[PDB]
Amino acid sequence: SMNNKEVELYGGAITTVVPPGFIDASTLREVPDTQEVYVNSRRDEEEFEDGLATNESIIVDLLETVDKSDLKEAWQFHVEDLTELNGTTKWEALQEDTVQQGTKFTGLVMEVANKWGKPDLAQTVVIGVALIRLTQFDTDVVISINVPLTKEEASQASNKELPARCHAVYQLLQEMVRKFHVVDTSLFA
């Protein structure tokens, strides 16, 4: 099972949870104004029952609402923005779920093609992506959790198997969405 702890985001205007051993990256380096970034800082020695390893990273980003009324289409639009950064030309959803009609959607995504034509030129990365639409405040919250796969997990990935750690990351992602709370709406314009 997981044992995530509550954290305050954006000066306390928002709360959610992250796993123990995950550090707020802003304590060491400036991060974009609309983002909160947490990276796994666990030593290889310590081993929780989280199912997590030591290299995942979590990003919460407050973005403008995308002009797509459909929840899945909006989620896909935001996934595309994250993947296109990596040179990704085609991606696949290993898992997807409408958590709440019209407002919360989550999934696990993976690149299957890139602009250089070398899908397996380097290590595979699975990204958990959630969209929380705060329609009232014109903001699409996008939470992404990067999962750089080991050689074995990648072999599973393209044998249509879902690595155990990816299942654990999805449970963390859904819990972050489940415990997401806007405590102070004066954060938005």
UniProtKB/Swiss-Prot annotation:
It is found in: Nucleus. Gene3D superfamilies: Mog1/PsbP, alpha/beta/alpha sandwich. One of its GO terms (biological process) is protein import into nucleus. One of its GO terms (molecular function) is small GTPase binding. One of its GO terms (cellular component) is nucleus. InterPro entries: Mog1, Mog1/PsbP_a/b/a-sand. Keywords: mRNA transport, Nucleus, Protein transport, Transport. Belongs to the MOG1 family. Present with 2840 molecules/cell in log phase SD medium. Involved in the Ran-GTPase system for nuclear protein import and poly(A)+ mRNA export. Interacts with GSP1. This is Nuclear import protein MOG1. The lineage of its organism: Eukaryota, Fungi, Dikarya, Ascomycota, Saccharomycotina.
